[model samples]
Target: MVEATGNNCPPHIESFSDVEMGEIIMGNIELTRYTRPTPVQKHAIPIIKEKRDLMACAQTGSGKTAAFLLPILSQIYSDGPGEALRAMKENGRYGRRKQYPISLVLAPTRELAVQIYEEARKFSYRSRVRPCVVYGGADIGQQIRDLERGCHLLVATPGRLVDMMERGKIGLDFCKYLVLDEADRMLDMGFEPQIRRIVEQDTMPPKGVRHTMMFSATFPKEIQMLARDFLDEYIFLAVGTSENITQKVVWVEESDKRSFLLDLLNATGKDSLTLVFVETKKGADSLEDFLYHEGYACTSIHGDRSQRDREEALHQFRSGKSPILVATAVAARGLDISNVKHVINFDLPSDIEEYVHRIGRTGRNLGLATSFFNERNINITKDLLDLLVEAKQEVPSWLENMAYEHHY
Candidate 1:
């Protein structure tokens, strides 16, 4: 139940089968095993399929990636990658030298670009569409090699994409679908110049000449202005918003969880007493090692560790020697750490009651519980929302919507 504030917005679809996106894409969606359309996907797909540009505001991980990908992929599949791309394939240089992608998706970070690329790969399986990603801080040589192999869907960071274009390794000449994901962040002063250069350049199709979509969690005036400039008459859509000892629900894709945790720790300060929970012993040790390598004073206690080591880890965390404790459900059993100021469900448990018990380990003292959630936890969403509301927590609109969808 996300609301839209634009004229002539297309009606939403109830299920994946409702759209005529071809058997391959439908089979791919079925392979992903989603039961129904998410709120964002429901509305965005219809509008995009109508060939209308869109400016959507939704929290991250609320199915925003698929919202944009599905329509573009469908159009390519049905429309046949355009004459320009087909002409390139007619020549022997199609997958040899410079690449001309039909659809371009720009993301803020390397992690996000990779995530979108992987999702694109999943949706484009056994199909002609090939999705490739390029971002800063990675091996450009390898990325160029990947691009040379041919790409119909190119997901990249602004800086790297610009670099590729300048090096004659990528061409937006045939790009018909342009998506500015996380538009707010990308339109900020930091990236505005690069984005402007990329879009305003004559090599890329003009605004109305190409279908453009901008998606963000926020829509400040500046961002909206930039969005308007880049997108032709577009449909505007907005959806869902969010605490407690304070409770926080962060929408995160599973792959981005580690980076989010690192950022959280960086802000919480190294000395803040924090307890982190994971689903398995291996996860606990892996996270503990990651944090330790990143220079955070962290320790772990899990089922696999010997009793002596577990006790030492607990003692270290309890005494403030190591303020971060990474543990599995084994530690959730009768563990009370009064001085702990934060509890992070790095990986949430399966049962809703188990989530309660995990957070309960924070003790009687004031503490915060921050849980990372996604559609993967749909089964427990209903119970989790009920518990949050019953406890007088300000339920995030996104989670509320998830709960609503779960019921229907």
Candidate 2:
């Protein structure tokens, strides 16, 4: 296990049976065949079960989804469908009515929202907790219909969540558990206002009145200060990076970028899943087109895409029908795609944190990340070099030289 740092964190559980989470959840865990918890899960399950407001630093697939969901779902399952849901059914108002969720999960992107929703469904199987997801770029009515069936755990992106609130499709009045997954990204400039509107609303329960859990791989101090308003006396947990990824950087001019990408992809073989990240929506589109024209199976997803198309593209990538996906930072937040052999940074992100999130998409041992860096991105060179050194990756001499030259 890596470092688990927090203020008086509960003693980490060695086994799932160590806690009092119900038999059904116990059985659910058994079905997955995981003999023990991941490091994040080891500490998180106990903390959340103790009803502690938590701020955890862990990447996706570190068992974070299960870490938060297991305890919350067990508690919900044991507590039974809450008063609000039961009363609605008692009054014969089950279907086609506005739903009030007991737990709400907010993610930064549609893909991540759906992924968490799927996990929630798996964990809550046969339980009264009906997990639903809502995000932009999709049919609002369809989402509302899913909500109408009654929901105890709701996963949503901020924009569509606000839209649902405005339309009276859902309310947070009864929300007892709140999860801000990928919280640093959620509190960024584009999303902070929507998050504030949702959490600070008159209808939502105030901090300390609810169990709040926030998770992100990277947390800036300003974001931490901002996140405090939503959490009450939280325990901040930082899990050491399970550094297993191979990181490499190459200097490529804009004109030579495509050729470089082609050579890298060709060298990596055709069957391995490769994710290519560009800086803009237009770049994603253009790069994907170029890859397809170059005779490689490819797809792209970005904010500008429709919900159906975005979902279709992701499905294609996952099935390996299109083994290569060109995307922007919209795909960077909290996506957990397994068997991703390589993450190619066709265009580097503006900051080190964004780079961290982007490279994190592929972290399976032996997974490779190749970034194209140039003079325009000198601002991040030092931090990138430091990160590589910190992770114990063999830093290229050229990157070291670039960082040294730019340092002074």
Candidate 3:
């Protein structure tokens, strides 16, 4: 294990070798052929394997998906297959030989849910753990069929999951492991009511009967309180800054921001994969139109867009067909899009935590990020400035002077 110093406290980084980690059922499959674990995996695996609740804080592209996925797989494999079936039969949800789900992982957005499902599938390739994904925008009939066939693990968005629970198509009563990936984003996206309802419903097991885990980049006070009710004696794990990301800020005039962005596009030379973050839905739509008219291929995702469009845009973006993606905070949060070389912040986020998550998209594969911020917007808060300084991002002298003018 390696130890690093942060905020005057020394944090230890645990190390895991394939030999010490034991043989995973599907570990031999070429999926996890790398056989290397990230820092988060080193600490999280042991705690999660013990069935203890966890609150993990790590930056994007830090292998967080596998950190939680691997431990849960170990837990499911440790007991061998068919135990989930026995538990379901005892609960009367299925016959003695029928297989039932024992785990549920919830994400804030469909893109994130799909990403988790893909990773889960890779880990369960040669194992008995049958994982399925359920989210809005697709046909409900197909999802119902998938549920009926039985799944050991189900990943879904809160809204669609609640609808399924209401239709009596799915139940969590037999579920033993519950993970809320991107807990802060779920709360931010107005899914709190749905999440609370799901937790209160009789379909799920009691708190003691279920082990819960919550993962996020930042932990606000409100989310912490909400998570306390669901998790038992939890262990809090925090990973420092994303060492893989190289952060940079580009200062530009508000009036010339769009032109500057176009210039940035031209500078890339190659058709590079880039993500642009805007503040509002209207802003996202406007940017998408502007980029489309400028002869650059682009797509936008926001709260107002249809589920089908969102899914298609995400698919195109992930497949490398769409080189540029412009989105609002709602769409940007909770998504795990790897290989993003550049992240452009067209508008500064009102909340500093959101800014952290936005620039996180870049420098994932040892890449670099370029952010743009305007000196205008009297509403710019002091907290945002403080965050920029804390992150070591260079703040322009003009912005610093403006902050002083407002006594910020």
Candidate 4:
């Protein structure tokens, strides 16, 4: 019931002893190797441990995953003698078993769902709490089989989760925890109906049996209202926009934008990893092709690309084989690629929240980020400009004058 306000500020973690914290985190496969909690973890875990719904806005690589996952895992595992343990005892490993999933995590994309599932798996590894993932553009039969076998935690994308619900493959009757990861991006991708449908259909306990948590980088007014319906007496946690991030706006003529981008890349050379974001799939494909033709190792990912192709491109980008990636809105939200040094907004996103997600890809893990905004393409709506100002990013005078002249 504590409200976390402002940037880099979280509730205290020492509220829970290191031993208790270790039990929850060591269950995570990757985090078990590390003993100390990050700053966000130090603050968020204690509040979440209290069973309060949370609205956390931690930066992309601030260990926010562990912050929320640890508490959710602890709650699910602590529930009355462990359902998974009981099920195994009753069914003896290979029988038609009754499954009761206590937690549900909904993410915006397939990659993010897989990533979260992996993280959850680590956290619940030895606790006998099985974690499974479902998303579109994947094998549905396997997901259904996994669900049938019984899962304590289900990580999914909105579309895939809805599909499963319609087929009667999964139900929320015993679900006690719900997490909407990257809430802003989910809304941006038009997932409101699916989310609402999932929530409404879930047999939520009369006394609000479920503890809900929503996490995102930025909070727009619309998203805040949507989130309120799912959360009850929630704690608001914000990491705030990083004042350390350096912002750059590159003004280029409409005809010269391509050349400007080329020059920018050439200037950076081969040692850096750059992410180029555009507004459309067509733009992404074209820019990726152009970059490839220019002898820069590059690839593209967008809605138009097949699921396999998208995954491959992302893998290549992350593996450093293709350090330069051209993407559209599809990659703008919740796609966490590590070690990205620069993010080029070749075509500015129409929504301001999208801008936050784009830049968030870089400067992660406390790394530095450089963003290039194309002023010519960016009409810079008053609302979007106001968002930038609020984030403390410098807006150019010419654009400000343009806003004034065009409106008045």
lDDT of each: 0.83, 0.83, 0.74, 0.72
The count of backbone overlaps in candidate 4 is 7
TM-score of 2: 0.58
The residue-by-residue lDDT of candidate 4 on 1-408, one tens digit each, is 124853334347543354254565454534555455655676678767777777787656777777788877876666534656655654535564334567888999998888888888778877767888889998888888888766778898999988987786666766788888898999999998998888875654422467888888878997689667877777777663255455676566667778888887887755578888887878887888878888989888887677799789888888889988888866544356757778787777666656766776676544343444554445555655576577677776755656666534
Top of the candidates by TM-score: 1
lDDT (10s digit) by residue, model 3, range 187-298: 9989889988877665788676788888888879977797678877777777752645666666677788899899888887565788888888998989889999999888
Question: Which run of 10 residues does model 2 get worst, by summed lDDT?
Answer: 88-97
Off by over 4 Å in 3: 1-22, 26-30, 80-100, 241-408
Which candidate gets the maximum lDDT versus the true structure? Answer: 2
Tens digits of lDDT, candidate 1, 1-408? 477767787888888878888898899988987666777999899889988999999867578999999989998999855566576653554435788888999999998899999999989998888899999999999999989777889998999989998998887877899999998887662887888878897488988889999998898998789877888888988865112256787888999999999988887854678889888888888898999899989899877778799789888988888999988875545345656678899887778867875776554446678999877887888888888877787688988887766345
> What does the lDDT read for residue 171 in candidate 2?
76
In model 4, the runs with Cα more than 4 Å from the true position are 1-11, 14-16, 19-31, 80-99, 241-408
Q: Encode model 2's per-residue lDDT on 253-290: one tens digit a residue.
A: 99999999999988977578998999999999899888
Candidate 4 all-Cα RMSD: 19.5
Reference-based lDDT, residue 138, model 1: 90
Q: How do all the candidates rank in terms of lDDT, highest first?
A: 2, 1, 3, 4
Alpha-carbon TM-score of each model against the true structure = 0.60, 0.58, 0.54, 0.54
